[PDB]
Design an enzyme around this catalytic site. Structure first.
Site, PDB file in Angstrom:
ATOM      1  N   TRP C 136      86.735  31.951  33.506  1.00  0.00           N
ATOM      2  CA  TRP C 136      86.035  30.757  33.972  1.00  0.00           C
ATOM      3  C   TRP C 136      84.978  30.437  32.940  1.00  0.00           C
ATOM      4  O   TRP C 136      84.016  31.181  32.794  1.00  0.00           O
ATOM      5  CB  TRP C 136      85.351  30.837  35.354  1.00  0.00           C
ATOM      6  CG  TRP C 136      84.787  29.495  35.749  1.00  0.00           C
ATOM      7  CD1 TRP C 136      83.499  29.116  35.640  1.00  0.00           C
ATOM      8  CD2 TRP C 136      85.491  28.365  36.298  1.00  0.00           C
ATOM      9  NE1 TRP C 136      83.344  27.829  36.068  1.00  0.00           N
ATOM     10  CE2 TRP C 136      84.547  27.340  36.494  1.00  0.00           C
ATOM     11  CE3 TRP C 136      86.823  28.123  36.650  1.00  0.00           C
ATOM     12  CZ2 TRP C 136      84.896  26.086  37.029  1.00  0.00           C
ATOM     13  CZ3 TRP C 136      87.164  26.887  37.172  1.00  0.00           C
ATOM     14  CH2 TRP C 136      86.211  25.874  37.352  1.00  0.00           C
ATOM     15  N   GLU C 208      83.616  37.071  29.372  1.00  0.00           N
ATOM     16  CA  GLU C 208      82.594  37.224  30.373  1.00  0.00           C
ATOM     17  C   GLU C 208      82.382  38.764  30.433  1.00  0.00           C
ATOM     18  O   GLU C 208      83.345  39.533  30.357  1.00  0.00           O
ATOM     19  CB  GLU C 208      83.093  36.658  31.727  1.00  0.00           C
ATOM     20  CG  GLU C 208      83.132  35.129  31.856  1.00  0.00           C
ATOM     21  CD  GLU C 208      83.876  34.752  33.088  1.00  0.00           C
ATOM     22  OE1 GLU C 208      85.052  34.612  33.090  1.00  0.00           O
ATOM     23  OE2 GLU C 208      83.158  34.632  34.159  1.00  0.00           O
ATOM     24  N   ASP C 241      79.927  34.980  27.353  1.00  0.00           N
ATOM     25  CA  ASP C 241      79.439  34.012  28.306  1.00  0.00           C
ATOM     26  C   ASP C 241      78.627  34.698  29.411  1.00  0.00           C
ATOM     27  O   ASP C 241      79.207  35.106  30.409  1.00  0.00           O
ATOM     28  CB  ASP C 241      80.668  33.255  28.853  1.00  0.00           C
ATOM     29  CG  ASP C 241      80.379  32.126  29.791  1.00  0.00           C
ATOM     30  OD1 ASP C 241      79.262  31.851  30.189  1.00  0.00           O
ATOM     31  OD2 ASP C 241      81.463  31.484  30.153  1.00  0.00           O
ATOM     32  N   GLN C 244      76.586  34.166  34.508  1.00  0.00           N
ATOM     33  CA  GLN C 244      76.365  34.737  35.823  1.00  0.00           C
ATOM     34  C   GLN C 244      75.715  36.086  35.795  1.00  0.00           C
ATOM     35  O   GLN C 244      75.173  36.572  36.807  1.00  0.00           O
ATOM     36  CB  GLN C 244      77.703  34.841  36.548  1.00  0.00           C
ATOM     37  CG  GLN C 244      77.990  33.465  37.151  1.00  0.00           C
ATOM     38  CD  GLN C 244      79.051  33.489  38.185  1.00  0.00           C
ATOM     39  OE1 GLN C 244      78.935  34.165  39.203  1.00  0.00           O
ATOM     40  NE2 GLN C 244      80.111  32.753  37.906  1.00  0.00           N
ATOM     41  N   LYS C 270      73.446  29.327  34.362  1.00  0.00           N
ATOM     42  CA  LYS C 270      73.142  29.400  35.800  1.00  0.00           C
ATOM     43  C   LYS C 270      71.839  30.057  36.147  1.00  0.00           C
ATOM     44  O   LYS C 270      71.005  29.462  36.821  1.00  0.00           O
ATOM     45  CB  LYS C 270      74.285  30.106  36.545  1.00  0.00           C
ATOM     46  CG  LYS C 270      75.608  29.351  36.557  1.00  0.00           C
ATOM     47  CD  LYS C 270      76.460  29.948  37.643  1.00  0.00           C
ATOM     48  CE  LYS C 270      77.716  29.136  37.937  1.00  0.00           C
ATOM     49  NZ  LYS C 270      78.752  29.446  36.908  1.00  0.00           N
ATOM     50  N   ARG C 404      82.319  37.264  46.675  1.00  0.00           N
ATOM     51  CA  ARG C 404      81.365  37.463  45.616  1.00  0.00           C
ATOM     52  C   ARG C 404      80.019  37.564  46.313  1.00  0.00           C
ATOM     53  O   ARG C 404      79.664  36.680  47.082  1.00  0.00           O
ATOM     54  CB  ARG C 404      81.400  36.411  44.508  1.00  0.00           C
ATOM     55  CG  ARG C 404      82.777  36.293  43.871  1.00  0.00           C
ATOM     56  CD  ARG C 404      82.831  35.374  42.646  1.00  0.00           C
ATOM     57  NE  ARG C 404      82.520  33.976  42.944  1.00  0.00           N
ATOM     58  CZ  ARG C 404      82.609  32.973  42.068  1.00  0.00           C
ATOM     59  NH1 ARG C 404      83.006  33.170  40.812  1.00  0.00           N
ATOM     60  NH2 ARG C 404      82.302  31.730  42.463  1.00  0.00           N
TER      61      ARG C 404
HETATM   62  C1  LIG Z   1      79.397  28.577  36.191  1.00  0.00           C
HETATM   63  C2  LIG Z   1      79.988  29.050  34.955  1.00  0.00           C
HETATM   64  C3  LIG Z   1      80.157  28.205  33.803  1.00  0.00           C
HETATM   65  C4  LIG Z   1      79.849  26.719  33.760  1.00  0.00           C
HETATM   66  O1  LIG Z   1      78.623  26.265  34.191  1.00  0.00           O
HETATM   67  P1  LIG Z   1      78.540  24.752  34.615  1.00  0.00           P
HETATM   68  O2  LIG Z   1      77.120  24.415  34.810  1.00  0.00           O
HETATM   69  O3  LIG Z   1      79.311  24.591  35.836  1.00  0.00           O
HETATM   70  O4  LIG Z   1      79.169  23.846  33.513  1.00  0.00           O
HETATM   71  C5  LIG Z   1      80.686  28.683  32.659  1.00  0.00           C
HETATM   72  N1  LIG Z   1      81.006  29.970  32.608  1.00  0.00           N
HETATM   73  C6  LIG Z   1      80.895  30.872  33.606  1.00  0.00           C
HETATM   74  C7  LIG Z   1      81.367  32.268  33.296  1.00  0.00           C
HETATM   75  C8  LIG Z   1      80.363  30.375  34.817  1.00  0.00           C
HETATM   76  O5  LIG Z   1      80.254  31.304  35.795  1.00  0.00           O
END
Ligand SMILES: *Cc1c(COP(=O)(O)O)cnc(C)c1O
Ligand SMILES: *Cc1c(COP(=O)(O)O)cnc(C)c1O
Ligand SMILES: *Cc1c(COP(=O)(O)O)cnc(C)c1O
Ligand SMILES: *Cc1c(COP(=O)(O)O)cnc(C)c1O
Ligand SMILES: [Rb+]
Ligand SMILES: [Rb+]
Ligand SMILES: [Rb+]
Ligand SMILES: [Rb+]
Ligand SMILES: [Rb+]
Ligand SMILES: [Rb+]
Ligand SMILES: [Rb+]
Ligand SMILES: [Rb+]
Lengths: 431, 431, 431, 431
Positions: C136, C208, C241, C244, C270, C404
């Site tokens: 994601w 991630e 990334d 989270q 986030k 989650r």
């Molecule tokens: C939420 C999320 C994103 C994207 O963030 P947005 O503000 O929705 O564009 C990207 N990568 C990961 C791993 C996320 O959990």
């Protein structure tokens, strides 16, 4: 001498280099299983040229046929039909399995795979193609996108939707399911991945029954059958590329007859032409009907040309009468046993595989480690040459060099034994 | 009769349909400028088959050559060199302009354009190709991505980096610079756009000197020269596809000789083989050298095969001796004048263009509006057939149907006058 | 009531549906770990909103800061620099590991991954991206091409050069090396395949540290380190990334600190914004220098905007002082143990994993088969709601639904115990 | 001083460069139409920041609203609905034209265009996008593939199916139809080309009503209407990007209201947020319904977040009450006339265009040749700065540098006259 300085001058100044390296000789004439240099020296052709000369070179029947036709019917406008074409198409319909009904006559191997891949993309409405990671399907555009054994770097991006899966390889197993090599589970593991990347447009899968360029890699038992079932479940066509394997070379008319799995599209080439530029695609009426309604187009200059079709019919008439598909098994067994004797003799030989007259010897440093023999293969190949045996070696990553052995279907007992000797001497003198 | 129900049965059950529609006849034999049906009826071949039979059908010299070679040297392993190959490569070097030095001998037209396009992508390090919007370069993968006259829909996405520009068309001008048709400014306008979309990877431009499939569209004066200069400025190669135009058909050995602009890669086909499957690419030593250092690869089964090369040499020997390139201009003028007479006679003929023996007649409803004549072309074509004249029509969007006229280079004064008659009658009886 | 018919009318007539299904309630206000409906009912926010509210909702310091800035410095022209921006960039430089030096302040998670992926493609000169099959990374263009957990079908072709590898998953092992799960060998097996398909333009890998959407899948021991080494060998950048996972959520400032592997580009989102739209990319001076010389461009409306930067600095000041990264481990252990007690109690719970306050509970039919519990998850989720516990479940192919759990870093002992209760009741009443 | 060495040290060591060049000053605070440096110097903000500050900086109502919400409702889980969201969606439905019914609330401009482009690709089943050659739609993935004014080179291949057409430009006409600039015929000429390259998958067209980055290029009369009709005929959606033009800036709520052509999807951004990160897409119920049935997905962290929505509602309440859309026309006329006076005075000014408060001045060497003034623009811009006027210039190929003028909608008569002065002086002192 082969040394003719004017010759080599002109060759050095006006030929484009396309891969490999020219033999340092001038082939003056060819006949049966031999090629003769400028000096009159006969070189035993153990690769059927470029794996095509199924009937050998200059087979008297092919000479008649080319004769009868050159001065009768040569080339026609793409919309005009003629007898040799209709007879060849029909003949192909009767000898291929039930389910393969209509053919399209063309010129090359890659042209045939393109026509196949374009019909499947038309028919399905999708564009993703999957192939093996060590495949060879051609130099042209789409054939080149499903090719993975070579030429993949430096020429730009590949066609969109291109994916590959590993080929099942018994010699050097890599996937393991509880103790042993689980090629079926590798298959499932592979397909899960594809499925995860697909954009929802899987259209087909091209597969060689035996990966020639990939090192004479025979698809293991129950594999095809399981592959076909993966395609069935996703809505994908299965295109079989029998360019090196069709026309008796492996002991059956078509390799797909062994496994008993009929493909959706079958592609023929090398052996169909027996040295000439002929090729075709064979498909089911249902697919053809459907391709026709959607506007399928594969118009070339040489589609349906008298001459070639005429040649191809003869190739098949000969194979049929002389029962060369059986000779292929008999001679094929003769060559194999000898190869295995060689293996007894030398530790470098790490594996002998293939089927009928489409064998592969995998050179290795030592059986235990199964370590690839670096440049020993080039030695062997050089030595063969000196003794008058024309061989060919392919070498891929993570593998030892593999000799592709594919003598004509018309090879004699003597010629076989002969090659087997030269091969022995060359190997002996190379370590 | 051509009606043989077994024949047509088998053709309906086992042939794949690839475009158009089969003529409702059986060609039994061919010779010179004629083809004969099952009934013995001679049909005057005004398209040289599929625009290839430059020497006509069954030209005695081509028959000898095919003979001398079928039983001598047929097909060889891709690394083995032979005389016919080296001589053909050399011959091509001497007859093409200075600057074209090394050739690669292959089988088809699209295969040759692929080899060209892959070498330019290798050499330049880029992948974008530009072509005309009404081009024809082949069915295979990359040739098909630069093709725009047809087969562009329903078969998936095209190769990445594909762009097209409009071809300069005098008959129906569209771009205007101060009062008149400014094809050079169209060119600049076009290129500005490309430049705006390029991702910085322009690698080449393929162009037909005369767009055959695109309706016999001759590139106007000073165009090529200006095109070549656009390529020069961006670092792009210029590939000329002389598949229908090379080998004397337009009154010069190669069309590129008229304009006096030598391309970077020149591709030959149809006319080189004279009906057989032969093809080649001719390039400069500098590019070849460079392609070689970077690992250029174009290995096929039929690259450098004795037979075909041998045929091609003869085609050129004949052309040369019989001075067929000049006949092409003379006969070419004879056919043209007659065509223009026809034009005087019938209002439907809206334009007659082309060069030498590669002419085009554009059927139209009325000269003033220059409105395309809907299905009148099919009439004319049907009528021709009945009278024994084989023609061919191409029809594209925004254009009237265009008859492609391309009789053999060996056409006689009589045969020409004859066709010209049949053509008259067919047109007369069709309105 | 939450039932307000005018509300729901307007929502049914004017909102675009973007995925999932709206809760059937109206959130009126939020504070700390709770959200309140129209009825005044407090719902315990166990997902920190959309996994962002690291400090909870309406944290008094964030309110001050938004206050001080809304009326002071709001939004500036993209070339104008201001204090909050420079301080935030600096702060990020000091708290991330050595090797991460320069940041770029943006708005969203997918925007940050795009900026990262574009800099790596610039810097390397290539364009192929590899990611996990259950990743994601965002909805926008390139982030969406490396996303594989969802939204991959029906929206056209993906970006060219997109490949995926399987993520190492201990819970449901699939690759086996001599008896056991060999995630490192899976890694090598995977990379061999990529290497076989690459066109020679691998540019980066996004990963991630813990796959959130992919079912709270923690990268096993020694994995990152080995991944980084695969990138090193090929010339690829490693983009992590930490959308989270950054900002203390897993018990370290950044997850990459655990493994001790510093990435080439680190992306934050986030948790950086704590609920607001702030995001950034952190890179090494060397890469930044290089990107700058080649003309790197990532200009937006909100890059370097006072307000947001200002907010982000505070988030980090709070985390730092209140030592919330440690609370994360302590509370984190409290929640985990309870979860495991639940597991003792109910057979449906098949696995509890994650780190610190970023936990995952995998619902299953029966531990032995480890069969996914079809719709039991929806039950549990429905029940939670009724009791006032807001949870979230993700469900992927071949897996059971995974809850989650990610409460704020400021969660209390009580709130934790509370949720743990509701969770128990909901599960009890759902079977 | 703005000179603070610690500041600049930290900025030089920790900020990533993303394009342009940082102003050599420190903005300390902002209010109304001015920004203040570290020295207290007020700089008149003639670009509304990055063309967003429609209500100016720190507009008391925006401060209240941000206040009321930061401590009340900040960020919620993506499935939870709240009042500010539903009210904003509704409000947008009522003020946009009939035909625009449902909105999706997001964060940035490029995020909004992505969501639009993904819905059109879903809805249509195709993937080709067409845009102008001088467009600006964003940095992210798909927005960046339809962007042509900049950032197109060195970052890899663009999304497949990307095409561009020239924008109609009156200032420097290029296409000519019988004597004059025929923008409609250019349109048709352009579309014919697209049609010739399309693979049959045209899905949409994105267009700015006024090309901002492209040099304040206003789409001429009858253009949109004709564009919409080209889309209609092919089955394509029309997405209008009103990021710089929506919210009164051009004298109408939405620019699309002038022409009277309602788009299929309308995208808002910069002016909607008034400086904050808010954005949205507005579509017809019919499309939304359809997107929903096919599974449309655009889930982000900030979709439907209280705070931002709340801000956006206020922006619109203010605009509405204070009747700022009319002020835009009045002040807009005041600025324009002055600009034209300047033009009388200096020969460098070659053109003044735009609408309402979204004006453009095109610097040129001499009106006759209309030759672009090389670096005179940088002079002017430097001079402006010294005098305290913040301007912005865009410079594209084949054009002169264009100043983008876009003061807040709340600009006073005085502020306008002031800027107009500084502008005069700067220009005077620059030649
Ligand atoms: C939420 C999320 C994103 C994207 O963030 P947005 O503000 O929705 O564009 C990207 N990568 C990961 C791993 C996320 O959990
Ligand atoms: C040789 C070969 C081809 C291509 O044939 P060409 O005539 O070279 O185009 C395709 N597939 C396989 C498996 C081959 O062995
Ligand atoms: C006929 C033709 C080709 C292709 O030749 P094939 O043998 O059909 O592959 C390519 N280009 C042009 C311009 C042609 O006329
Ligand atoms: C500014 C702008 C965008 C993008 O907005 P961001 O917030 O920078 O992503 C898109 N389109 C146009 C026409 C713009 O002017
Ligand atoms: Rb033909
Ligand atoms: Rb059959
Ligand atoms: Rb060959
Ligand atoms: Rb030459
Ligand atoms: Rb900004
Ligand atoms: Rb650091
Ligand atoms: Rb949200
Ligand atoms: Rb509306």
């Amino acid at each position: 001498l082969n040394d003719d300085a004017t010759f080599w001058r002109n060759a050095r100044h006006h030929l484009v280099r396309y891969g490999g390296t020219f033999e340092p000789m001038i082939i003056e004439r060819a006949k049966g299983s031999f090629v003769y240099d400028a000096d009159g020296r006969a070189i035993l052709d153990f690769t059927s040229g470029q794996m095509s000369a199924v009937l050998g070179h200059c087979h008297p029947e092919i000479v008649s046929v080319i004769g009868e036709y050159a001065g009768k019917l040569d080339h026609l406008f793409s919309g005009m039909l003629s007898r040799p074409v209709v007879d060849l198409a029909t003949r192909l319909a009767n000898i291929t399995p039930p389910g393969l009904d209509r053919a399209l006559l063309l010129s090359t191997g890659a042209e045939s795979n393109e026509a196949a891949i374009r019909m499947a993309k038309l028919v399905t409405g999708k564009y993703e193609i999957v192939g093996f990671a060590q495949s060879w399907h051609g130099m042209t555009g789409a054939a080149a996108s499903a090719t993975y054994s070579a030429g993949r770097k430096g020429v730009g991006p590949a066609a969109v939707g291109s994916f590959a899966i590993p080929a099942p390889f018994t010699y050097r197993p890599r996937f393991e399911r509880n103790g042993a090599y689980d090629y079926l589970a590798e298959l499932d593991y592979a397909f899960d991945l594809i499925d995860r990347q697909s954009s929802g447009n899987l259209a087909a899968f091209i597969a060689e029954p035996i990966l020639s360029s990939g090192g004479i890699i025979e698809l293991p038992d129950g594999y095809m059958a399981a592959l076909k079932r993966k395609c069935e479940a996703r809505g994908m066509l299965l295109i079989l590329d029998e360019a090196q394997t069709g026309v008796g070379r492996t002991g059956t008319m078509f390799a797909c007859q062994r496994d008993g799995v009929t493909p959706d599209i079958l592609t023929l080439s090398k052996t169909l032409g027996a040295g000439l530029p002929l090729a075709a695609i064979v498909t089911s009426a249902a697919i053809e009907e459907r391709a026709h309604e959607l506007g399928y187009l594969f118009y070339t200059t040489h589609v349906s040309d008298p001459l070639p079709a005429a040649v191809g019919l003869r190739v098949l008439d000969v194979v049929q009468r002389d029962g060369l598909v059986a000779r292929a098994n008999v001679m094929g067994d003769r060559l194999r046993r000898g190869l295995l004797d060689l293996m007894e003799r030398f530790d470098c030989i790490g594996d002998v595989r293939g089927r009928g007259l489409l064998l592969g010897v995998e050179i290795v440093k030592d059986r235990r480690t199964k370590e690839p023999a670096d440049g020993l293969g080039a030695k062997i190949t050089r030595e063969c040459m000196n003794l008058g045996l024309s061989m060919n070696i392919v070498q891929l990553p993570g593998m030892g060099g593999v000799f592709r052995i594919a003598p004509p279907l018309t090879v004699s007992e003597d010629e076989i034994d002969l090659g087997l000797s030269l091969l022995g001497q060359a190997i002996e003198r190379a370590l």
